[PDB]
A paper describes a structure:
The Cullin 5 (CUL5) [name] E3 ligase uses adaptors Elongins B and C ([name]/C) to bind different [name]-box-containing substrate receptors, determining the substrate specificity of the ligase. The 18-member ankyrin and [name] box (ASB) family is the largest substrate receptor family. Here we report cryo-EM data for the substrate, creatine kinase ([name]) bound to [name]-[name]/C, and for full-length CUL5 bound to the [name] protein, RBX2, which binds various E2s. [name] and CUL5 behave as rigid rods, connected through a hinge provided by [name]/C transmitting long-range allosteric crosstalk from the substrate through CUL5 to the RBX2 flexible linker.
We first determined a 4.1 Å structure of the substrate–receptor complex containing [name], [name], [name], and [name]. [name] binds as a dimer to the N-terminal ankyrin repeat of [name] as previously predicted from HDX-MS data, kinetic data, and modeling. The structure of [name] residues 25–34 was resolved to reveal a partial fold of a helix and a turn inside the active site of one monomer of the [name] dimer. The partial helix positions D32 in the active site of one [name] monomer, consistent with previous biophysical experiments demonstrating the critical role of this residue in the interaction. The cryo-EM density revealed an unexpected structuring of [name] residues 25–34, which form a partial helix in the active site of one subunit of the [name] dimer positioning Asp 32, a residue previously identified as critical for binding affinity. [name] residues 13–24 exchanged over 90% in both the absence and presence of [name] whereas residues 25–31 showed significant protection upon [name] binding consistent with the structure formation observed by cryo-EM. These data suggest that the structure of [name] residues 25–34 may position D32 in the [name] active site leading to the higher affinity binding of [name] 1–252 as compared to the weaker binding of [name] 35–252. Peptides corresponding to [name] residues 25–31, 25–42, 43–52, 50–59, 64–84, 85–99, and 100–107 all showed statistically significant decreases in exchange upon association with [name], demonstrating that at least two ankyrin repeats of [name] engage in the [name] binding interaction. Peptides corresponding to [name] residues 176–214, 218–237, 238–248, 249–258, 249–261, 262–289, and 284–291 all showed decreased exchange in the presence of [name]/C.
Author numbering:
A (entry chain A): 6 to 323, 333 to 381
B (entry chain C): 25 to 294
C (entry chain E): 2 to 106
D (entry chain D): 18 to 46, 59 to 86, 89 to 112
E (entry chain B): 6 to 320, 333 to 379
């Protein structure tokens, strides 16, 4: 395309000025790498510039170190490996090029967490994303490609049984009353407004072929063609982490089966696990967490220090959303185990703090 | 934007947050004219104002405040616009925010503007906070006092400023006075200041140790402590007593005392 | 040790002593400056003539009173022939008014 | 002992060795300090003893009133103390 | 190329649902046309999915429409003329592709313009824009030539003399002090915020190689690589459009010849005049406007149609010529000047309690 004209200029003329930028890509991409990599492309249509587009478009933040790049398809992880290996390694804490990643949604490996104390655990939630092999990712796919994915999802979702039975809504033509119902339950989403998303082009043609499906019990939610291909969220008020994890697993187990019956499968390989858009969601792409009533620990001086070692993320709300801080190098259910462990520790931490007791004896050297 | 999208924090910025953190004033105005309200917040209750304060973008906070931004809004980490301004150091924003009602004192003890400025070396912001109405000797658990913190980070500019303002030279963290802190950090420069402002060389820390006992005898400080082991001069005592009659930052009134300029300077340069 | 200030009219003297020492020795402490013998001296506390045979401790003086921070006050009169001089001591000058800037709010 | 004279005519008998606290007095070696009022000269003397007593041994705080702080400062300046 | 991959799908799958749109593009592009041109492309690689992306992304206002099409370069107007021609025809109120358009940079043709009533004319300006033949238009340019263009523009602008002498403000290193000054004078141009612009991709790499050049007397602005390659703005307070225009015409001519001294020239052809990214602005691309204090007439119910009759826009009002193509540059500002004079007297009628009647134009 217009890249042919790019090839008429010296690499340094094309080389973007990342001086004011602060992200993982920015530290990784050098003039030397740019000069080399700009000559390569994927069979799907990617070129270095699109890989680093969002990056150069957004310096990001002086404190929040975003990734600064985005993948295009499965092949692009190999084609632009010379950046991804440095970016992935840095973003995921030393994840090496030969560090085999595993997978495991078998609920039998989750110990305890049958009932977290409901005095603290307001609610539990599990979230992930999957991409369908054979298609490209949202930053690149055409209208036709996007539409095909929608249809596949609609078919599979229409066949889920039991509690996984539900209804599909077509975002582009859903009724305002329906919008009211789904916005109240926060199942309704809308066009991306962050410049960190818009720079990728994921909003192209919106709302064409964007879709919402949820089950009858409002515990199983999936979004179609949004931030990534299939966005899956399982949730339930209460502290029953064990059951929610299982529900989630059976959701993906049946959906994968249904796709396999049509010769489709999720993008996956032994090295990066599940293949998604941004680098931060490689491997498991699994997030899990809870809403905990911690008015006490939220004021304690070492709260963030404890969470740091527990490898948990601290987030507010639209009381804390405590969640899995890792994505790659851990066996899915293993990460859920980490969340259960940390939360129970925090509950006890809070118990002692509530009673005015020293809490130093509950601060393990977790790394 | 408008709801718990249950996505990553990276996906929740408004265009205003982006404009705010990088100083895109006209863009900000344009977004406002489209209808992006200034009180739109994200995940941790972070407003454009909070980001603008971190960036130090004075004109942006003027605009945001002009349109009703919450000058005392509190984030999930207990941060306020004022606190954030102190973090960046923006002297102008600190003044402005205070003029619009920013409380010098924070609700949470995890984020004191004064203590932050003390650690950063933001002397003129310390000045403004105190002058506006800030407790220069506020003791806050893990951080002790502003003075103590300045000493911990070797912020001699703030140390001198605070002590002249009237910081309690002998009040640090727990039993660890600022003087003990200097001994631990081996600073002859800060030692000289603290001694001159009335630091107690015989005070004991939690371990029952005097500042001189917290530093190796081979150091210059050992000699410096020896110089002040005996009783202080009468003039020293007088100066200390005189200074006690003035409040925080009120010692400028010393210039009105009926006495020789030499002594006036002696008192003013405490 | 006893830090004692002794005064007469407009004279003042500062001297140290032992709690176990008596007024009699103290009389000779005065003698060293006065150049008049103990019998011509009248040491007194407040308005109470001091007893040569009592110790400073016995007379109510101690480390908690007669300090280096601020000594005790004993007066001195003399034996005017068959009597002794008025037991009066002239106070030092009064204090100046405290300046408004140092005055408390 | 050395007799010091205040501006108001008071006579202070001070052990010479304590008097030597003052740099000015050391330079002067009876002394008439017509420059210093009785209101504070006695105070200075007390200080001389205070400093001597605690030169080599804890040290208590020297007492001082705001009514004398200013004049005393000046006197101390004069006496090199 | 992914273009070839898209061609593996039937046109039916790739055709966008334009029934949700109210812009001109949506009323021109048929699925048949789409199928016909889908496999076509320019020498730059620009395709249909690029030319209508904006029109697709932004549904458009239910009453006020736009075009929604964005060119890639001059050539793309020819390559996809089967789409653009019907768009242009409707956009400018009737215009056949054979109707050769005129150009006119000689102020001498303007009769008047140096004598408007300063009690109503507060200020006036002239805006237009150019692009350099040989480079792609912003929506599809890379950083390389964006920088090459900047280099040329700045170099040439630095050689201007007299009241055209000035200086350049590179946005990437422009200070807050400078920022404040440029904001005060409405010179500063920040990042685009409209979906109609954002959808073109023109906001990428912001603000790499973007900046402002202006003269010492604060009458000429050249926005470099902003909404087009060269945005030329000329302005001055008071009712002396003519001089503004003479500076504009001759200043513009000078910078044009300076590019020509370096073997560069502005995109220009007999049927579209000068070339810009948005179809509505093809032609002269000349927008002269004026701030008119107008308290009485502004409340009169026929004010709207009067401007219509005069070919003026109702943007104190900012009145400007409503056309960009259909007649020459001088003709255009002549209409602006005449309109202002007419409008002044119209208000005067109302001020004196008189009716408008015979002041109504055609």
């Amino acid at each position: 395309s217009h890249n042919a004209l790019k090839l008429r200029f010296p690499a340094e003329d094309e080389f973007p000025d990342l001086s004011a930028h602060n992200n993982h890509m920015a530290k990784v991409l050098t003039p030397e790498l740019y000069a080399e990599l700009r000559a390569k492309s994927t069979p799907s249509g990617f070129t270095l510039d699109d890989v680093i587009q969002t990056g150069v478009d957004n310096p990001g933040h002086p404190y929040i170190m975003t990734v600064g790049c985005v993948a295009g398809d499965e092949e692009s992880y190999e084609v632009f490996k010379d950046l991804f290996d440095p970016i992935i390694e840095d973003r995921h804490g030393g994840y090496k090029p030969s560090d085999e990643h595993k997978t495991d949604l078998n609920p039998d490996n989750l110990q305890g967490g049958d009932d977290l104390d409901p005095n603290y655990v307001l609610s539990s939630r599990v979230r992930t994303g999957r991409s369908i092999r054979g298609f490209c990712l949202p930053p690149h796919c055409s209208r036709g490609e996007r539409r095909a994915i929608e249809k596949l999802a609609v078919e599979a979702l229409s066949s889920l049984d039991g509690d996984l039975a539900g209804r599909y809504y077509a975002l582009k033509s859903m009724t305002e009353a329906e919008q009211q119902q789904l916005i109240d339950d926060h199942f309704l989403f809308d066009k991306p407004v962050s410049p960190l998303l818009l720079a990728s082009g994921m909003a192209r043609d919106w709302p064409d072929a964007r879709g919402i499906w949820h089950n009858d019990n409002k515990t199983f939610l999936v979004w179609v063609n949004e931030e990534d291909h299939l966005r899956v969220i399982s949730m339930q008020k209460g502290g029953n982490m064990k059951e929610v994890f299982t529900r989630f697993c059976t959701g993906l187990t049946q959906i994968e089966t249904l796709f396999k019956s049509k010769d489709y499968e999720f993008m996956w390989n032994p090295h990066l696990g599940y293949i998604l858009t941004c680098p931060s969601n490689l491997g498991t792409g699994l997030r899990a967490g809870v809403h905990i009533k911690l008015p006490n620990l939220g004021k304690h001086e070492k709260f963030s220090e404890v969470l740091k070692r527990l490898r948990l993320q601290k987030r507010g709300t639209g009381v804390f959303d405590v969640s899995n801080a890792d994505r790659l190098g851990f066996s899915e259910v293993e990460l859920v185990q980490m969340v259960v462990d940390g939360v129970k520790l925090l509950i006890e931490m809070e118990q002692r703090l509530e009673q005015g007791q020293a809490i130093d004896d509950l601060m393990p050297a977790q790394k | 934007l408008s709801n718990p999208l249950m996505g990553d924090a990276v996906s929740d910025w408004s265009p205003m947050h982006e404009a705010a953190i990088h100083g895109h004033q006209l863009s900000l105005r344009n977004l406002i004219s489209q209808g992006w309200a200034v009180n739109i917040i994200t995940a941790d209750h972070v407003s454009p104002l909070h980001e603008a304060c971190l960036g130090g973008h004075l004109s942006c906070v003027k605009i945001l405040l002009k349109h009703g931004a919450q000058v005392n809004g509190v984030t999930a980490d207990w941060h306020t616009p004022l606190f954030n301004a102190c973090v960046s150091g923006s002297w102008d924003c600190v003044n402005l925010l205070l003029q619009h009602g920013a409380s010098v004192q924070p609700e949470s003890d995890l984020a004191s503007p004064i203590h932050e400025a003390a650690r950063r070396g933001h002397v003129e912001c310390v000045n403004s906070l105190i002058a506006y109405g800030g407790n220069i000797d506020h003791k806050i658990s893990h951080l002790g006092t502003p003075l103590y913190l300045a000493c911990e980070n070797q912020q001699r500019a703030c140390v001198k400023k605070l002590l002249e303002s009237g910081a309690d030279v002998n009040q640090g963290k727990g039993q660890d006075s600022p003087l003990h802190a200097v001994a631990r950090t081996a600073s002859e420069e800060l030692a000289c200041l603290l001694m001159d402002f009335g630091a107690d060389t015989q005070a004991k820390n939690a371990e029952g140790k005097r500042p001189v006992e917290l530093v190796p005898p081979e150091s210059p400080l050992a000699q410096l402590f020896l110089e002040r082991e005996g009783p202080p001069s009468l003039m020293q005592l007088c100066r200390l007593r005189i200074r006690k009659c003035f409040g925080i930052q009120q010692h400028h009134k010393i210039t009105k005392l009926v006495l020789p300029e030499d002594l006036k300077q002696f008192l003013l340069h405490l | 040790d006893v830090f004692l200030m002794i005064r007469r009219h407009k004279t003042t003297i500062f001297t140290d002593a032992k709690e176990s020492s008596t007024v009699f020795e103290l009389k000779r402490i005065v003698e060293g400056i006065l150049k008049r013998p103990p019998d011509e001296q009248r040491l007194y506390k407040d308005d109470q003539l001091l007893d040569d045979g009592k110790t400073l401790g016995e007379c109510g003086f101690t480390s908690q009173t007669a300090r280096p921070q601020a000594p005790a006050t004993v007066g001195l009169a003399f034996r005017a022939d068959d009597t002794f001089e008025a037991l009066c001591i002239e106070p030092f000058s009064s204090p100046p008014e405290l300046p408004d800037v140092m005055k408390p709010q | 002992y050395v007799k010091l004279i205040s501006s108001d005519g008071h006579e202070f008998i001070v052990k010479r060795e304590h008097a030597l606290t003052s740099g000015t007095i050391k330079a002067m070696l009876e002394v008439n300090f017509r420059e210093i009022p009785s209101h504070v000269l006695s105070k200075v003397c007390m200080y001389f003893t205070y400093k001597v007593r605690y030169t080599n041994s804890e040290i208590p705080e020297f007492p001082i009133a705001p009514e004398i702080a200013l004049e005393l400062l000046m006197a101390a300046n004069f006496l090199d103390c």
